[PDB]
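Holo prediction. Input below; ligand is 2-acetamido-2-deoxy-beta-D-glucopyranose.
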Amino acid sequence: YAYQTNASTYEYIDIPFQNKYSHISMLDYNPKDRALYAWNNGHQTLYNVTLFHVI
Amino acid sequence: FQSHIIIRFDLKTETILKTRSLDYAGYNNMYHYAWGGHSDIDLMVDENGLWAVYAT
Amino acid sequence: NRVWYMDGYHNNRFVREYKSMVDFMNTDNFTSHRLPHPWSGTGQVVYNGSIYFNKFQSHIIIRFDLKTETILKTRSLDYAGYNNMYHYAWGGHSDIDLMVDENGLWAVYATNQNAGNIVISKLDPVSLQILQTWNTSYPKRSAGEAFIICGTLYVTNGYSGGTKVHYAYQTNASTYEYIDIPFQNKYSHISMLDYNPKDRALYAWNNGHQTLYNVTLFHVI
Amino acid sequence: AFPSSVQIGGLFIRNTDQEYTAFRLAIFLHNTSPNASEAPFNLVPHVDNIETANSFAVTNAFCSQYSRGVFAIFGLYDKRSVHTLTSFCSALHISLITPSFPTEGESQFVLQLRPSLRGALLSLLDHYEWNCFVFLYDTDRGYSILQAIMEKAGQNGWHVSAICVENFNDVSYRQLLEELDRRQEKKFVIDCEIERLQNILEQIVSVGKHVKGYHYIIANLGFKDISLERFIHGGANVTGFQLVDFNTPMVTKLMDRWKKLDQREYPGSETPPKYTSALTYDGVLVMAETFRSLRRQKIDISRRGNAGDCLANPAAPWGQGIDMERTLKQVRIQGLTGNVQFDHYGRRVNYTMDVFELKSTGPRKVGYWNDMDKLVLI
Amino acid sequence: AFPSSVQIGGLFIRNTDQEYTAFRLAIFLHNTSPNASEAPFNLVPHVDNIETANSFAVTNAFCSQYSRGVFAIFGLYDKRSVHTLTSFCSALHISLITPSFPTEGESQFVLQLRPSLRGALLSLLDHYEWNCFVFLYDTDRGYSILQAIMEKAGQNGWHVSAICVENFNDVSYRQLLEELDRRQEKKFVIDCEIERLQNILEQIVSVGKHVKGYHYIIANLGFKDISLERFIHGGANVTGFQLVDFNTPMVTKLMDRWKKLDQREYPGSETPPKYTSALTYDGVLVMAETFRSLRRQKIDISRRGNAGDCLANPAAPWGQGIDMERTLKQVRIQGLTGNVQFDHYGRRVNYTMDVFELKSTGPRKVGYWNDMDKLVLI
Ligand SMILES: *[C@@H]1O[C@H](CO)[C@@H](O[C@@H]2O[C@H](CO)[C@@H](O)[C@H](O)[C@H]2NC(C)=O)[C@H](O)[C@H]1NC(C)=O
Ligand SMILES: *[C@@H]1O[C@H](CO)[C@@H](O[C@@H]2O[C@H](CO)[C@@H](O)[C@H](O)[C@H]2NC(C)=O)[C@H](O)[C@H]1NC(C)=O
Ligand SMILES: *[C@@H]1O[C@H](CO)[C@@H](O[C@@H]2O[C@H](CO)[C@@H](O)[C@H](O)[C@H]2NC(C)=O)[C@H](O)[C@H]1NC(C)=O
Ligand SMILES: *[C@@H]1O[C@H](CO)[C@@H](O[C@@H]2O[C@H](CO)[C@@H](O)[C@H](O)[C@H]2NC(C)=O)[C@H](O)[C@H]1NC(C)=O
Ligand SMILES: *[C@@H]1O[C@H](CO)[C@@H](O)[C@H](O)[C@H]1NC(C)=O
Ligand SMILES: *[C@@H]1O[C@H](CO)[C@@H](O)[C@H](O)[C@H]1NC(C)=O
Ligand SMILES: *[C@@H]1O[C@H](CO)[C@@H](O)[C@H](O)[C@H]1NC(C)=O
Ligand SMILES: *[C@@H]1O[C@H](CO)[C@@H](O)[C@H](O)[C@H]1NC(C)=O
Ligand SMILES: *[C@@H]1O[C@H](CO)[C@@H](O)[C@H](O)[C@H]1NC(C)=O
Ligand SMILES: [Ca+2]
Ligand SMILES: [Ca+2]
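Structure of the complex:
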């Protein structure tokens, strides 16, 4: 799911990622590093985002 | 714990400043995630500032 | 916002000066300016206060003023084909194509040393001197048309029927990539397709009709 | 004083993306060779990718390449453009290395890479003891197979029901299959184009003749490039031919290089190469070999002055074209399709093909056909 | 003093994107309605997509929705979750509107929208005079069809070869089909899930039993949603049932909005609605109708004091739940599946289905089956 608060719209996407250790409890986005900090079944993992801008 | 109260705590001076109440929010496994575990309120930040995701 | 109009590809030397888009879409009144030499093909450009064109059956680029009506620079493109040897797929003496982008003035031609492949060059807008050249791997005789958005050359595959953007060359990284971006050829035969950065739009000539495309660009962060 | 860069021409037609990819890959591998003896020169391809080969764009492309000073032209043709290209190449002493369908009377500076499917089909027909069958054919590759089949039927008293399916649609295919099933005709030989063959197989499966009791002989040079999974499940007899051996060190090396290629820079690399791309690669290797051999004989090939108008009043041919033709016809190399060797007519000789039969596990090699040994079974 | 917002519950199953889309579309159409009589309140759905972990997850979702103060729950179930959900709904006096497979044992606070398929199947098997056939079934929807078939075979002397294909793979499917064809069995009745039925049909086409002479009866409520293309060309006899009539003004009125929906905002709208989605839409309409009827009865619905834990030591049923169930069993509406009306057991009564047959042009309406009129042909 995706919600744009600026336009107050919603869109069903299907971007996939990988639950390597089969359980996710925390998943947050950190601006400065542009990365997703995640807690995977008692382990600390990071994901990298891919943001695109259309003109 | 067991309340819809957002608390700001200093990690440098080790004191309390603000303890506010999230208006119309569930607590104690009322509106948790799919995995549960008392995740009714999720606090995050982004390039615009501080945001809270909950349910009403 | 004055548009510039040219008909023919062999011996015409008259350009039109419709002063406005409303004076071009409906009004059939125009000012006819003569050229010292006729052009070849549909590859010319109007940049700043002048027009860059090709001089008859030669590999010569001429800068002509559209206000003072004189010649300041007339140079020769180095190792560039002329007189229907490295044309597009539609022919018509389109051996040299001139375009502009946010970085400046570019010329797409072909070289005998580089087989018959498309070669890009950056030209000085004043002195018409070669600044830097880039080698691509797409033959010009099978291209049909090409256009530059900003430092990237997009090359079509055909001129009538199923037309699509087939080739892309990034001169900043000097890398090539085959893409599939269809665009609709409504009126069969196409002759000219150029890019305008101010309107960010593709101006095209489709079987005697003047057509506009609005492009979509994306940037990855 | 051999030139450091020899110029060759290339003429490609519609639906030739993978063959052009193989041509470009072979050009890459020849030019950037670490060996200093494999590439004593460079290959400069002047490429024309036309859409409609209608003997007029073909003539324009040939004249444009001839004006550029090319030595040999790697060209593809169809039934509407073979004669013009062959006549233009023979008149001006310009060699034409073609991977398209072989024709008869195509000597004088034409070298065909595709082996003939005439002897193998007859050697499979008489071994299977077929005397009453159907022949679904098209005329997009000539009339040699049909003429040979009719001659064999006349000389052996066979009953061949020859049907042309050039203008047959899907429901017409279904009606034809039902009509042939009414007359208890369960033995078929299909000699059509790849898309037409796939449509015929799809119609056969849809109407329900892919079961035991039906036999199909596929007249094609590639048997592993056609999907026959439902034919495997049904159990019908399917027999075909293969030209490129996938268990060959050269072919496996090509496959290793091919699976490491980018699809965005080398289109058509998402699938294993067909026999046409293999013939293109062998043709580029043959051109490199004959250019190296011309360098060995100290022949300075140079088309200076001869380049000009193709349709001149005095027909002026290339003075060194006959040497190029002789050196091209005297090659004998080993490559993707096995042994590449040509006779004095420009046709491939001692070529070996593998006959495959469809079984429950899948395709299964049952023997090989050789030009001098006929059919040999295992 | 009826509340302006009425809370309903929604429990959804794995692979339920399209039915949830239909539920959301019906909620949209009810909430934002120009008529003030069609929407005197606002439906508030509490939705849980659980990806069921059986009765544990079902009980957790039911307790979570029950604590929120829902009046009725629109939930789905499977063979591993029907009993616990029905018992929880009946014990706590919470109505359960389910478009899932019909059952018999549950008789309190359960409203099933899917009509039974035993009567139409028996009428078709006795009008076709079938006496020896093969019944391929699965136990993902109960044992009612198998029990009815065995009872009819015992009372009529039929020869039914009953095979459970729950743990069958494609290879085993092909072996079973070949074995059944060896025993000269050409009459089949298939009662399986949609994916299992599609796999069975694909295997049938693979072995080649889609030719004329083979008869298949599909025990499914949707016949036009099955990809039957090769069976048309082969000529096999296919007979099926359809619940929703696409030539109905209400159905085409919905289809006008369905083709105008956005895929990225309403996922699953890229395909025509199945019978499950139509039953979901009819169930939402039934909930709206019974809430309006409760409004007309001057019954102040509320769950202020009953909101709490499900597993309390004293059972605390909802006082007004019996009023909701009585009003729910008395509805008679017109919707996508036709006449929606229920008996005192909460089962479908007075419903009409269309029996279709596969011809050379496509599915042809042959007859219609009604609950009291049995099978009537045209
Ligand atoms: C487009 O043309 C204008 C004038 O026609 C150029 O302006 C000149 O700018 C240079 C330095 O910026 C001055 O020395 C000249 O005197 C200007 N010209 C005139 C007539 O005053 C402008 O630079 C041109 N644009 C580009 C990108 O070169
Ligand atoms: C564009 O390609 C041509 C041909 O491949 C290049 O010309 C060759 O340049 C190399 C130097 O890198 C010389 O060693 C060769 O002798 C040149 N070939 C001929 C036939 O003259 C040309 O340099 C390339 N241009 C650029 C900018 O890379
Ligand atoms: C048939 O073609 C084959 C090509 O493989 C020829 O076999 C080679 O013949 C040469 C002699 O001319 C030997 O040096 C090679 O070792 C042979 N290759 C092998 C055995 O793999 C064969 O000579 C040709 N036959 C005729 C009659 O021309
Ligand atoms: C079965 O459904 C039909 C409607 O399809 C019912 O016919 C309706 O009966 C009521 C009386 O109860 C009339 O007011 C309607 O006008 C009838 N509708 C028609 C004829 O289209 C029929 O009564 C139902 N039968 C049962 C036993 O419930
Ligand atoms: C397309 O571009 C032209 C250029 O002026 C202009 O009409 C407008 O920006 C666009 N028109 C559209 C998006 O309809
Ligand atoms: C390099 O060339 C020499 C002579 O042409 C040959 O003997 C050798 O096998 C070649 N090696 C490779 C790796 O191609
Ligand atoms: C199919 O091939 C087998 C041998 O593999 C042969 O025995 C059989 O007769 C063939 N069937 C037909 C119909 O030709
Ligand atoms: C809306 O529909 C209801 C039910 O048919 C009807 O009673 C009411 O009059 C309608 N309102 C309008 C404004 O048409
Ligand atoms: C097939 O269906 C048609 C139409 O119902 C019927 O007449 C025919 O007897 C059937 N054939 C078989 C073999 O069931
Ligand atoms: Ca989070
Ligand atoms: Ca252009």
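Residues C 97, 99, 145-147, 192-194 surround calcium ion (ligand 11) (CB under 6 Å). That is the main takeaway for now.
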